[PDB]
Amino acid sequence: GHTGKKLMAQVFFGPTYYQRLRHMVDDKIHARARGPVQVLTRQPVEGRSRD
Amino acid sequence: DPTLNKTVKIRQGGYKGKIGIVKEANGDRFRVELHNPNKTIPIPCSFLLIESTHGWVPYED
Amino acid sequence: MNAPDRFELFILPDDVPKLKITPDSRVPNCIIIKFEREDHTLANLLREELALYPDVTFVAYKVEHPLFANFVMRLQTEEGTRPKQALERACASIINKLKTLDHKFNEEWNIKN
Amino acid sequence: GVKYTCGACAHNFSLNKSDPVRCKECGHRVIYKARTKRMIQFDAR
Amino acid sequence: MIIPVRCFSCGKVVGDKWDAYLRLLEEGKQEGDALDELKLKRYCCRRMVLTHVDLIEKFLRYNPLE
Amino acid sequence: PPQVRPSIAMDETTQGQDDLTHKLSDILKANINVQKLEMDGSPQHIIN
RNA sequence: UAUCGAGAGGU
Numbered sequence: 308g309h310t311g312k313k314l315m316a317q318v319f320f321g322p323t324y325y326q327r328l329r330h331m332v333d334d335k336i337h338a339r340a341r342g343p344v345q346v347l348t349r350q351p352v353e354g355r356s357r358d
Numbered sequence: 359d360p361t362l363n364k365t366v367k368i369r370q371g372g373y374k375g376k377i378g379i380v381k382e383a384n385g386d387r388f389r390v391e392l393h394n395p396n397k398t399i400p401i402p403c404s405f406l407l408i409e410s411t412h413g414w415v416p417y418e419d
Numbered sequence: 420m421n422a423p424d425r426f427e428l429f430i431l432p433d434d435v436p437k438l439k440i441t442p443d444s445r446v447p448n449c450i451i452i453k454f455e456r457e458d459h460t461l462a463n464l465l466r467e468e469l470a471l472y473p474d475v476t477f478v479a480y481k482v483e484h485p486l487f488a489n490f491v492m493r494l495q496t497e498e499g500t501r502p503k504q505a506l507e508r509a510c511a512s513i514i515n516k517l518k519t520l521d522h523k524f525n526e527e528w529n530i531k532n
Numbered sequence: 533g534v535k536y537t538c539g540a541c542a543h544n545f546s547l548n549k550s551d552p553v554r555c556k557e558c559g560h561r562v563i564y565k566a567r568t569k570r571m572i573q574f575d576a577r
Numbered sequence: 578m579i580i581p582v583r584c585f586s587c588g589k590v591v592g593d594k595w596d597a598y599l600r601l602l603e604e605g606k607q608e609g610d611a612l613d614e615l616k617l618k619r620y621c622c623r624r625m626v627l628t629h630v631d632l633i634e635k636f637l638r639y640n641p642l643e
Numbered sequence: 644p645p646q647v648r649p650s651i652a653m654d655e656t657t658q659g660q661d662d663l664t665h666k667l668s669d670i671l672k673a674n675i676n677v678q679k680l681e682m683d684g685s686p687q688h689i690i691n
Numbered sequence: 692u693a694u695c696g697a698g699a700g701g702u
């Protein structure tokens with residue numbers, strides 16, 4: 308596509324049935340600087356959903 | 359500040375014509391929560407129209 | 420969530436130049452041109468045109484990362500010619516070839532009506 | 533005060549929070565909030 | 578859900594051909610020939626109409642909620 | 644101290660005690676009943 | 692911005 312030149316190799320090409328799986332990156336991405344701690348250990352809490 | 363949480367229209371920039379809400383207006387640089395995609399953008403307060411009693415009024419509301 | 424605005428591919432920020440020329444002093448008479456908000460479309464077009472000039476000794480370009488709409492070109496000309504000038508000529512040369520091409524299409528189009 | 537809609541008979545009505553939660557028309561106790569006064573915009577992309 | 582407006586792969590409009598495609602099938606044409614008559618030449622475009630499932634007909638059976 | 648055995652609030656206004664707090668309560672109750680026997684109604688097989 | 696568990700999953 309960049310040059311319009313043919314590819315030296317031919318490409319296996321055609322329809323195939325593909326699935327959209329439940330795993331999406333913006334449901335997983337997570338970062339923590341500081342945030343909440345456990346009352347008993349004062350160590351950071353567990354889980355994306357709790358910071 | 360008197361324009362937080364009030365509905366806004368953008369009149370300049372790449373987001374021109376889009377609806378939003380003033381999420382945070384600390385000073386000069388506001389944070390408008392766009393309606394159309396799920397993102398809150400930085401925008402100068404000069405770029406906004408606020409809704410009031412009669413139509414969309416610039417930052418004289 | 421971290422997706423940039425699609426208009427950033429072609430709208431130039433006001434503090435960002437469409438074009439920036441610096442020298443490559445490692446060899447004589449060579450410039451590096453950084454093009455902002457441009458594609459293979461412009462770069463490959465200029466590149467071939469330039470490479471066929473007899474007084475162009477080196478021309479290449481690369482898009483360093485497909486997620487950012489810029490590219491960088493390297494252009495060296497022989498002692499006689501000044502590199503930036505050869506680039507100006509390639510622009511006007513290609514504009515002319517496209518003017519001709521637009522004319523011949525217009526004519527051929529009426530002929531096919 | 534606030535517009536609702538009956539989940540069974542689709543009657544539209546209002547309630548002043550203190551009213552019991554049912555439809556005046558059929559007495560159904562499952563109701564749904566009517567849409568916002570606010571304008572909605574989408575980017576058509 | 579409802580016929581897509583464009584072919585995903587090339588962009589050709591196919592959202593104006595759904596009724597014509599169903600009509601050709603009532604008239605007894607085979608699916609391949611019906612697609613041929615509709616001028617759907619690239620197989621990306623043929624896939625769009627041949628494999629679409631009209632679910633909006635199912636969703637409409639649910640008595641409107643206003 | 645309570646730092647070792649903190650209380651938790653299930654629904655804002657409802658708080659339960661740590662397992663250790665309850666277990667020390669059990670030791671304290673059981674301790675009082677040893678004092679209540681050897682000084683009055685002790686049927687021996689009950690003191691044990 | 693709870694605690695204890697359980698179940699289903701990701702590499």
Ligand SMILES: Nc1ncnc2c1ncn2[C@@H]1O[C@H](COP(=O)(O)CP(=O)(O)OP(=O)(O)O)[C@@H](O)[C@H]1O
Pocket residue numbers: 702
């Ligand atoms: N149950 C588990 N416990 C621990 N580590 C695990 C694991 N399941 C997966 N992993 C990690 O993930 C790797 C598995 O990689 P996969 O993607 O599952 C297979 P592969 O051998 O890399 O490729 P293949 O699919 O070509 O055979 C393990 O080697 C380990 O690094």
Ligand SMILES: [Zn+2]
Pocket residue numbers: 538539540541542543555556557558559560
């Ligand atoms: Zn009702």
Ligand SMILES: [Zn+2]
Pocket residue numbers: 584585586587588589619620621622623
């Ligand atoms: Zn197609």
